[PDB]
């Protein structure tokens, strides 16, 4: 039998975080909001929806600055460059567009995806964008020459998520074939495969200060440690298709569930300090309750969620909350926890 640790320090005691509450709901999109991108100076954010428009909203007012057209299918990705005045969109129409924000016009196309594109990440230090789609491939594109410099193959399902970080593993692709692949960017080779999830991996995120990441499939979130992909912990209790995941600079994991569910977790301990259920915009069906995309702003004080009732919901953490009003209900249980 593999030995466990009986020190009772393997379970960190959760830090206290205030609960989150609804602040805003922004209408105007005529499709499910599936993209969201806060610009690096925290002034505006970018929503892409099923009405194939990209809308630029002021973050402070929630007030519609601009609408950009040019896609013909649902916008799935969006990225405001911190080093260039560029925005990056991908869609279900196989198009990966680079928008010049100084002209509000599409200036580049990154062509080569055989099907609709679901994800798009900018490399934090290199001049590279990464897309994944329904063709089972993560395309790694050079920004300047529009050249598909890497074809990351090995997944047998739709590549649904992807993260770029500055150290190896530089690409992490979660796919609907229930596997997660860790990719060395320099060679285009799989460093590792994680097959712990039973269902299609739909959400990934990386921690801002720790060298760890998290993956999420239905009913299960798993925290892993880079660069070896060692299984760190489970986030448990969100029995839904999890589309999204948002960790904060203050260690908050946000899982949004396709049935309209929400879980706010403490990152280090795995404790669920909040469990919410979103509400639908009037006129919606019960089936239209669902958080389809989410992000934090650069401050981390606002959670932006795009939801399948075509809405934008801003969430603030409660300023009138103290550790006495919302006590941590976690105890160091002594259970085998059959793995």
């Amino acid at each position: 039998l593999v030995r466990r640790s009986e020190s009772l320090l393997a379970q960190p005691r959760p830090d206290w975080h205030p609960p989150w509450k609804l602040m805003r709901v922004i209408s105007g999109h005529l499709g499910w909001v599936r993209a969201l991108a806060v610009e690096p100076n925290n002034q505006w954010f970018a929503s892409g929806a099923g009405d194939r428009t990209i809308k630029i909203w002021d973050l402070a007012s929630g007030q519609l600055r601009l609408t950009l057209t040019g896609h013909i299918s649902t916008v799935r990705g969006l990225a405001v460059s911190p080093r260039h005045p560029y925005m990056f969109s991908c869609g279900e129409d196989k198009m990966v567009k680079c928008w010049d924000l100084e002209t509000n016009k599409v200036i580049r196309h990154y062509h080569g995806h055989l099907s609709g594109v679901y994800t798009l990440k900018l490399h934090p230090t290199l001049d590279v964008l990464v897309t994944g789609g329904r063709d089972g491939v993560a395309r790694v594109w050079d920004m300047r020459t529009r050249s598909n410099v890497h074809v990351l193959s090995g997944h047998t399902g739709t590549v649904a998520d992807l993260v770029c970080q500055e150290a190896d593993p530089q690409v992490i692709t979660g796919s609907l074939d229930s596997t997660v692949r860790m990719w060395d960017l320099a060679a285009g080779k799989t460093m590792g495969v994680l097959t712990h999830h039973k269902k299609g991996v739909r959400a990934l995120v990386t921690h801002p200060t720790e060298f760890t990441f998290a993956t999420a499939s239905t009913g299960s979130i798993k925290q892993w440690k880079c660069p070896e992909g060692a299984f760190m912990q489970n986030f448990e209790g969100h029995n839904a298709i999890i589309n999204t995941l948002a960790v904060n600079d203050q260690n908050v994991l946000f899982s949004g569930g396709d049935n309209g569910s929400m879980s706010f977790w403490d990152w280090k301990s795995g404790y669920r300090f909040q469990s919410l259920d979103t509400t639908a915009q009037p006129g919606s069906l019960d089936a239209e309750l669902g958080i389809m995309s989410s992000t934090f702003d650069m401050s981390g004080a606002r959670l932006i969620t795009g939801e399948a009732d075509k809405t934008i919901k801003i969430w603030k953490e409660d300023t009138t909350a103290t550790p006495e009003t919302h006590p941590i209900e976690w105890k160091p249980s002594l259970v085998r926890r059959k793995y």
């Binding site: 090995g154 495969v193 097959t195 712990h196 039973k198």
Partner: protein
């Protein structure tokens, strides 16, 4: 080294290798063949 029977030590060689002059007008010489995909890398254990 020694090859084709005999095992006498042949003198070592200095070889000048130059790229061949190619006709600038020559089109591509060979057709492109559509070979099916090879098998993938050996799949990992399923850690459910």
């Amino acid at each position: 080294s020694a090859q084709m029977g005999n095992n006498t030590k042949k003198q070592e060689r200095i070889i000048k290798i130059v790229e061949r002059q190619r006709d600038p007008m020559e089109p591509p010489k060979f057709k492109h063949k559509k070979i099916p995909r090879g098998p993938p890398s050996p799949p990992p254990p399923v850690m459910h």
